[PDB]
Design a protein around this ligand. Structure first.
Ligand SMILES: *[C@@H]1O[C@H](CO[C@@H]2O[C@@H](C)[C@@H](O)[C@@H](O)[C@@H]2O)[C@@H](O[C@@H]2O[C@H](CO)[C@@H](O[C@@H]3O[C@H](CO)[C@@H](O)[C@H](O[C@H]4O[C@H](CO)[C@@H](O)[C@H](O)[C@@H]4O)[C@@H]3O)[C@H](O)[C@H]2NC(C)=O)[C@H](O[C@@H]2O[C@@H](C)[C@@H](O)[C@@H](O)[C@@H]2O)[C@H]1NC(C)=O
Ligand SMILES: CCCCCCCC/C=C\CCCCCCCC(=O)O[C@@H](COC(=O)CCCCCCCCCCCCCCCCC)COP(=O)([O-])OCC[N+](C)(C)C
Ligand SMILES: *[C@@H]1O[C@H](CO)[C@@H](O)[C@H](O)[C@H]1NC(C)=O
Lengths: 97, 275
């Protein structure tokens, strides 16, 4: 059975402009396990680290992608996910709020 | 009241793409905390924590590693050869967890297997039980395990003898870290406007450890019934992040607060006021 990925984006610590922090992209509930996850800065790829592949009690997969970032009123950050069940790469923007 | 994880599991993810291409990914976990990685090519374990070997000797760990390395190689070969017999069609994913779990008192053990993302079999108490949906293919597999008594005996040993010992040893070895109390950071924001005259009030709770937590929107003392419990999501440092949301009228947001209860805080909840 095929299941689409769910995506959430969030910061490790309370965001504060100009203050170093981590941006997390959590992608879960998906099947099969092949997947491409990239965090983005203004629609462009920054270096991130990706957890080892794992799965939940119902067998659906999850991954945590995370990177250092410094938020500010100007820059936009997002997470971009490529999966066989997605016609086009899905982008979820960091909504600080 | 017992703090931190109560279970250990080996985890296998095996992808079969075609007659010549298959991939295994392996790891070891205490509940949802990874304590082992696995380098597939060489069949090398990665000891993520100072206490990842629990109370086991190096020689015992090495034997177990040699064993898992041989297993992956054999598992792959066997599935490849039996693709037609079990009428499997490429591409296909097999998932396996094997390990054991504390229950307030006798430790329980089992191996669970999945195919195509669905319950396929479970193996416990020197018995194979195919999942109710697994069909003839399930019954065939269980029949097969009785042709493989050596492999079955190794697995039952691992489940009933080795694992209970390992779990108790490793909870003791990593006790300080596994039962540490880390206080959450909390903050409020207002999310994307959901409709005319309404606010999305979001309470963010991050960095707490252990996992159990209770976050609730309040007005004074009354719990708000609109409170939306987000899912626990992991951070990269063995803590978790949670969003708790409230969809409320704009002229009613005044006097609301988010109440955070967590074991690290004792009886004094953290409170955050909206204004
Ligand atoms: C790793 O730890 C395992 C878990 O042990 C417990 O937790 C650890 C952290 C520590 O607190 C231990 O004290 C805990 O027991 C070890 O396995 C356990 O070993 C103990 C022996 O120390 C087993 O127990 C015995 O059970 C026997 C079965 O009937 C009893 O005969 C015996 O009772 C006698 O001894 C006690 C004194 O301890 C007296 O009070 C009694 O009067 C009586 O004379 C013991 O109670 C226990 O069953 C094991 N638990 C599990 C889940 O398997 C383990 O120790 C190794 O493995 C066991 C099976 C034995 O072979 C040990 O000799 C051996 O060292 C550790 N594993 C490793 C690799 O070190
Ligand atoms: C500490 C680091 C952690 C690392 C992570 C490890 C991840 C492993 C995860 C889970 C596995 C848990 C059990 C491992 C036990 C070891 C097994 C063993 O005895 O190991 C066996 C395995 O061989 C096999 O044949 C594997 C059996 C698999 C059979 C599957 C065929 C079914 C096909 C049909 C498909 C239908 C769908 C399937 C559903 C899925 C159900 C499974 C061999 O030995 P050994 O004596 O030569 O040895 C000697 C050591 N050296 C050689 C290295 C020197
Ligand atoms: C199998 O998969 C690989 C890529 O994963 C490909 O190169 C190869 O041509 C495929 N087909 C066969 C018959 O091996």
């Amino acid at each position: 059975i095929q299941r689409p990925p769910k995506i959430q984006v969030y910061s490790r610590h309370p965001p504060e402009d100009g203050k170093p922090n981590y941006l997390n992209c959590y992608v879960y509930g998906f099947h099969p396990p092949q997947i491409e996850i990239d965090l983005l800065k203004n629609g462009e790829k920054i270096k991130s680290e990706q957890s080892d592949l794992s799965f939940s009690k119902d067998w659906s997969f999850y991954l945590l992608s995370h990177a250092e970032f410094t938020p500010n009123s100007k820059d936009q950050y997002s997470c971009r996910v490529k999966h066989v069940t997605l016609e086009q790469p899905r982008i979820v923007k960091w909504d600080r709020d | 009241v017992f703090q931190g994880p109560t279970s250990f599991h080996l985890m296998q993810i095996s992808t079969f793409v075609n007659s010549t291409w298959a991939q295994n990914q392996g790891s070891g976990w205490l509940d949802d905390l990874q304590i082992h990685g696995w380098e597939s090519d060489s069949g090398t374990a990665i000891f993520l924590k100072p206490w990842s070997k629990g109370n086991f000797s190096d020689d015992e760990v090495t034997e177990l590693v040699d064993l898992f390395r041989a297993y992956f190689i054999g598992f792959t070969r066997e599935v490849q050869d039996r693709v037609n017999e079990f009428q499997l069609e490429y591409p296909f994913v097999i998932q396996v967890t094997a390990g054991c779990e504390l229950h307030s008192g006798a430790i329980e053990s089992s191996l669970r297997g999945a195919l195509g993302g669905l319950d396929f079999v479970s193996i416990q108490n020197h018995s194979c039980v195919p999942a109710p949906d697994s069909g003839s293919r399930g019954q065939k597999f269980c029949a097969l395990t009785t042709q493989y008594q050596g492999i079955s005996d190794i697995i039952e040993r691992l489940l009933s003898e080795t694992c209970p010992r390992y779990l108790l040893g490793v909870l003791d070895a990593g006790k300080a870290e596994l039962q540490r109390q880390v206080k959450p950071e909390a903050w409020l924001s207002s999310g994307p406007t959901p409709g005319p005259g309404r606010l999305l009030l979001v309470c963010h709770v991050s960095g707490f450890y252990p996992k159990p937590v209770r976050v609730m929107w309040m007005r004074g003392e009354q719990e708000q019934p609109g409170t939306q419990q987000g899912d626990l999501m992991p951070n990269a440092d063995w803590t978790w992040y949670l969003r708790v949301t409230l969809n409320v009228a704009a002229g009613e947001a005044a006097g609301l607060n988010c109440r955070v209860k967590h074991s690290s805080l004792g009886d004094q909840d953290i409170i955050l006021y909206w204004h």
